[PDB]
Amino acid sequence: GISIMVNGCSGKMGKAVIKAADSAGVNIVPTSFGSVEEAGQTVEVCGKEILVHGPTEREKVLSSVFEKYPELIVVDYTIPSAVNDNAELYGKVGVPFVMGTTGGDRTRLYKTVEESKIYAVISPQMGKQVVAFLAAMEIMSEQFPGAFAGYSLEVMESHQASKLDASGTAKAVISCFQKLGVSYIQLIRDPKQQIEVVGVPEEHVSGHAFHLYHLTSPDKTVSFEFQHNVCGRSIYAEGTVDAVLFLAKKIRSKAEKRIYNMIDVLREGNM
Amino acid sequence: GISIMVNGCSGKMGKAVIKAADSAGVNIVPTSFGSVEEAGQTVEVCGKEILVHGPTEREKVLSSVFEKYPELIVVDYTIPSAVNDNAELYGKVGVPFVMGTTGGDRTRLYKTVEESKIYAVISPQMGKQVVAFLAAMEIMSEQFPGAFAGYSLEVMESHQASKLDASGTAKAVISCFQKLGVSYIQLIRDPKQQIEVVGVPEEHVSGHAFHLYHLTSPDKTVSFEFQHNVCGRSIYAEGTVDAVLFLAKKIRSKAEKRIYNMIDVLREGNM
């Protein structure tokens, strides 16, 4: 009983969102908004045909789609320069949305959405499991400052990982180690990379989007590793879908809180 | 200004504690308690000569050492069958202690120590950084139940890791993944072991005490790893020393709370 509009359906991420939402039984409206260049084009995805509209009378077009689909939630994976415009558009129409798009005037974004009093999930990281790992490290560092005093950190991050703004995420993880007492990045190219585990070489699969955080004790007798590898965009699509389902529950319940993030989603549980 | 008695100084762990405590400038009393077999023997360690006493009039001997060293804290790394006896001995004398010894009647242990109203740190895991990792996972699982619903877990654990009762620790970590929505151990022999990271073999250094927790998404596009390797007993010695320093601060401050664990130590910070 939920329908979504995927703004940015012509991109790799919009496509992945469509697939995931479809697997979860979410209805996909055959309509979208895009740039002037994309206006008029149809997007063939997952058996769906989506008609991309340009900016001519957007507000009115979005409204009519919203009147036909009162259960609508917009998913926004667009471009930095559309973030504020699109949030204002969603605001004027009153339609709830989930925005994974990075960049834009982020302060203006939060201002707009709070002012317009609509329901939204805003999260620059939609890989919910990565967010959960980050939140664990934030909590550990908050509870136990200095627990790793003296340990040395090496951090590795692949090219694909860097680009899909997880340097935001990597930076926040590093802050957690610092607060844990570490004094402290290798951007990596090869599909494998080596570290020293108790004086012994260890080869790590560093293809696709890869992050490795390696801690070593002063006397080199203790090694800790935290690693993740992500291929494609499934994790981000699945988390985006989780945010849609979360936001639908909040709308249905008429919750006082309006603007939400991936921590909020994670606390609700699996849906 | 702190002195310690190392009960179990003839073992590998007592020796490591002595080294660590000495590096931290903690004074080491030239006196200890041991079994009948060890009675009379001198233990040469770290330049120190420690005289091991058997059980003949223990209570009186320990008392005289305590009168000569009012700042004393006993470190207990003995054997399961001495845990309760020794705790009762420390209780009768009134001497504070830090016990890393595993096994014994653990319920009786807590009962005794609470009744005798002495200061103590009791912790079956003294590897403080491992405890911090466990506590992070406990918190993540507590905050975000179901965050990894559907992911599959493989857990590997080496022989040395299993024996130094970190199966307690591994079990508790696994509970955290279950609460995170996972449905769910390979005891490993070889110095290297393979896992599948996005359809690609990854060789892991699995010598000494090794733990690997590997999570995979249903579609196999997401891999997470948490690993630690420990060589020797330095980590446990260093954590034991941290508990001594923690307990000294509590005694000096005259704290109402009497019986403490490694979470308490971790929250205090680096000392």
Q: What is the DSSP track for chain B?
A: --EEEEETTTSHHHHHHHHHHHHTT-EE-SEEE--TTTTT-EEEETTEEEEEE-STTHHHHHHHHHHH-TTEEEEE---GGGHHHHHHHHHHHT--EEE----S-HHHHHHHHHHHT--EEE-S---HHHHHHHHHHHHHHHHSTTTTTT-EEEEEEEHHHIIIIIHHHHHHHHHHHHHTT----EEE-SSEEEEESSSSEEEEE--SEEEEEEEE-TTS-EEEEEEEEE-SSHHHHHHHHHHHHHHHHHHHTT-S--EE-HHHHHHH---
Residue A31 counted as an annotated binding residue: no
The answer to whether residue B208 is catalytic is no
CA distance B176 to B186: 18
- The CA-CA-CA angle for residues A103, A109, A110, to 5°, reads 120
To which residue do tokens 């992500």 refer?
A230
Q: Which of A138, A229, A235, A265 is most worth mutating to test chain B (most B CB atoms within 10 A of its CB)?
A: A229
| B78: Cβ contacts below 8 Å, ≥ 6 apart | B7, B8, B86, B101
Number of other residues whose CB lies within 10 A of the CB of residue B247 = 22
CA distance B200 to B192: 16
- The residues with which B205 forms a beta bridge, in sequence order, are B192
- Experiment type: X-ray
Which chain A residues have a beta carbon less than 8 Å from that of B144? 132, 135, 266-267, 269
CB–CB contact A136 B135 (8 Å): no
Tell me, yes or no, if B24 comes closer than 8 A to chain A by beta carbon: no
Tell me, yes or no, if B266 comes closer than 8 A to chain A by beta carbon: yes
Q: How many helices (H) and strands (E) does chain A have?
A: 9, 15
- The residues with which B28 forms a beta bridge, in sequence order, are B4
Tell me, yes or no, if B80 comes closer than 8 A to chain A by beta carbon: no
Alpha helices of A119-210 — where are they, by DSSP H? 128-143, 159-161, 167-179
- The CA-CA-CA angle for residues A233, A119, B151, to 5°, reads 35
Question: Sign (positive/negative) of CA torsion B179, B180, B186, B187?
Answer: negative
φ/ψ region of A220 (left if φ > 0, alpha if ψ in -120 to 50, else beta) reads: left
Tell me, yes or no, if B59 comes closer than 8 A to chain A by beta carbon: no
By C-alpha distance, the chain A residue nearest B20 is A219
Residue A5 counted as an annotated binding residue: no
By C-alpha distance, the chain B residue nearest A232 is B221
CA distance A96 to A103: 20
Number of other residues whose CB lies within 10 A of the CB of residue A215 = 21
The answer to whether residue B163 is catalytic is yes
Which chain A residues have a beta carbon less than 8 Å from that of B200? 205, 207
| A107: Cβ contacts below 8 Å, ≥ 6 apart | none
Which chain A residues have a beta carbon less than 8 Å from that of B231? 198, 221-222
CB–CB contact B226 A225 (8 Å): yes
Catalytic residue among B163, B171, B192, B249: B163
CA distance B32 to B264: 27
Distance from CA of residue A262 to its chain's centroid?
Answer: 8
**Amino acid type, A30:** P
Which chain B residues have a beta carbon less than 8 Å from that of A269? 144-146
SS3 A201: strand
Residue A125 counted as an annotated binding residue: yes
Query: Could you tell me the end-to-end alpha-carbon distance of chain B, in angstroms, rounded to an integer?
Result: 14
C-alpha count within 13 angstroms, C-beta hemisphere, residue B151: 27
CA distance A147 to B267: 9
φ/ψ region of B45 (left if φ > 0, alpha if ψ in -120 to 50, else beta) reads: beta
Mapping DSSP onto H, E and C, the string for A48-79 reads: EEEEEECCCCHHHHHHHHHHHCCCEEEEECCC
How far does the CA of residue A220 sit from the closest CA of chain B (Å)? 9
Question: Sign (positive/negative) of CA torsion A226, A230, A236, A241?
Answer: negative
CB–CB contact A207 B223 (8 Å): no
SS3 A227: strand
The answer to whether the CB of A71 falls within 8 A of the CB of A2 is yes
Tell me, yes or no, if A225 comes closer than 8 A to chain B by beta carbon: yes
C-alpha count within 13 angstroms, C-beta hemisphere, residue B202: 25
What is the stated resolution of the deposited model, in angstroms? 2.3
CB–CB contact A147 B128 (8 Å): yes
Angle formed by the axes of helices B12-23 and B234-252, to 10°?
Answer: 60
By C-alpha distance, the chain B residue nearest A266 is B144
Which residues, numbered 129 to 158 in chain A, qualify as contacts with chain B under a Cβ-Cβ cut-off of 8 Å?
Answer: 129, 132-133, 135-137, 139-140, 143-149, 151
How far does the CA of residue B210 sit from the closest CA of chain A (Å)? 9
CA distance B224 to B153: 10
CB–CB contact B129 A147 (8 Å): yes
**CA–CA distances in Å: residue A206 to residues A228, B55, B263:** 9, 58, 35
CA distance B119 to B261: 11
CB–CB contact A222 B231 (8 Å): yes
Number of other residues whose CB lies within 10 A of the CB of residue A143 = 15
Catalytic residue among B48, B92, B159, B208: B159
The answer to whether the CB of B77 falls within 8 A of the CB of B11 is yes
Number of other residues whose CB lies within 10 A of the CB of residue B194 = 12
Q: What is the dihedral of CA A148, A151, A156, A162, to 10 degrees?
A: 40
By C-alpha distance, the chain B residue nearest A151 is B129
